[PDB]
Amino acid sequence: NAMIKQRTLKNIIRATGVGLHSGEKVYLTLKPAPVDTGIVFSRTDLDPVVEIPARAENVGETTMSTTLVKGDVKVDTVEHLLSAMAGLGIDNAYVELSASEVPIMDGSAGPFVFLIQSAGLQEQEAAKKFIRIKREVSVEEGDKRAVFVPFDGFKVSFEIDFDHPVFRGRTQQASVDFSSTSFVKEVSRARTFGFMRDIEYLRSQNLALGGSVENAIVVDENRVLNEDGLRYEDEFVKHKILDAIGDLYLLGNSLIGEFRGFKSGHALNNQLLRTLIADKDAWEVVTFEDARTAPISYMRP
Ligand SMILES: C[C@@H](O)[C@H](NC(=O)c1ccc(-c2ccccc2)cc1)C(=O)NO
Numbered sequence: 260n261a262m263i264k265q266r267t268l269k270n271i272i273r274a275t276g277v278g279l280h281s282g283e284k285v286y287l288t289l290k291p292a293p294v295d296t297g298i299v300f301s302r303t304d305l306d307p308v309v310e311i312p313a314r315a316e317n318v319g320e321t322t323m324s325t326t327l328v329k330g331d332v333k334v335d336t337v338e339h340l341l342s343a344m345a346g347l348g349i350d351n352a353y354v355e356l357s358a359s360e361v362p363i364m365d366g367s368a369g370p371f372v373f374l375i376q377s378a379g380l381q382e383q384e385a386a387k388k389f390i391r392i393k394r395e396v397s398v399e400e401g402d403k404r405a406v407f408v409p410f411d412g413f414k415v416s417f418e419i420d421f422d423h424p425v426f427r428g429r430t431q432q433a434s435v436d437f438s439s440t441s442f443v444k445e446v447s448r449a450r451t452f453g454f455m456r457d458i459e460y461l462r463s464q465n466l467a468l469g470g471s472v473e474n475a476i477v478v479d480e481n482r483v484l485n486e487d488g489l490r491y492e493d494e495f496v497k498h499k500i501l502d503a504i505g506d507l508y509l510l511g512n513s514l515i516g517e518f519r520g521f522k523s524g525h526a527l528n529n530q531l532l533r534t535l536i537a538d539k540d541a542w543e544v545v546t547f548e549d550a551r552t553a554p555i556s557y558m559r560p
């Protein structure tokens with residue numbers, strides 16, 4: 260008789276930071292929103308205020324980060340904040356930003372999960388809608404691949420392939436089944452990362468202006484440059500899982516299914532969502548009026 264309900268924020272919560280790509284200072288405000296609103300970004304620095312729903316149809320650029328666009332108005336680097344929202348099961352929220360990029364914080368979803376849980380969650384008087392994968396859907400480009408597989412729960416598998424001394428062994432693949440593994444404990448703290456030769460190229464072009472060892476793992480030709488080391492033995496692949504969860508949440512609803520990524524990035528993740536949405540026979544919308552019968556579990560609000 261206990262139904263799985265939609266969730267929003269119990270209180271407003273505020274954060275400040277800098278954009279990884281733009282280097283601009285930005286004020287972030289997360290606000291409660293009504294049932295069936297979904298996640299909506301709002302550029303409050305503009306006149307009039309521009310709202311951009313966090314949906315696959317509004318993705319505009321996918322080079323290095325996922326960017327939402329509406330006309331000429333952009334919201335860059337939404338993936339880590341959306342991963343935190345998805346991890347905590349937030350259905351409805353307003354995300355107000357004073358600039359064109361979500362703050363990078365420490366490069367992970369950790370600060371966002373903590374800010375959300377500090378504000379608390381509010382269950383709403385409406386059933387949470389899930390998108391259930393009924394048939395396999397895959398997208399490929401070159402040697403990159405991203406797949407949705409029917410699965411009674413939610414599971415993300417990812418494999419990276421870097422021919423580099425730091426990237427050897429079993430730490431290049433990971434699978435997380437959220438029926439037994441905690442998004443907060445095992446995925447949320449995984450930071451973004453960049454290779455020194457790529458970073459140098461980006462800096463030569465006056466790009467990635469906000470990036471440093473304070474908000475990213477920096478790896479040169481042989482080692483991790485961050486003095487204090489890694490948060491997980493497999494932090495790099497866990498961050499790709501974090502990215503995939505955030506990019507997947509642009510479907511607008513939590514998924515019941517499995518994602519498998521092989522060298523996939525924001526572009527291929529978004530192509531997978533667009534293929535799934537277009538293949539209506541591959542999915543269905545489902546609700547759980549009895550939480551006992553559900554294959555996905557959310558933490559108490
Ligand atoms: C891991 C990869 O998918 C991506 N991150 C980057 O592309 C990236 C690019 C540049 C930096 C960087 C780090 C330090 C200084 C300058 C740039 C960090 C991450 C990412 O996390 N997208 O969400």
Ligand SMILES: [Zn+2]
Pocket residue numbers: 338339451498502
């Ligand atoms: Zn990322």
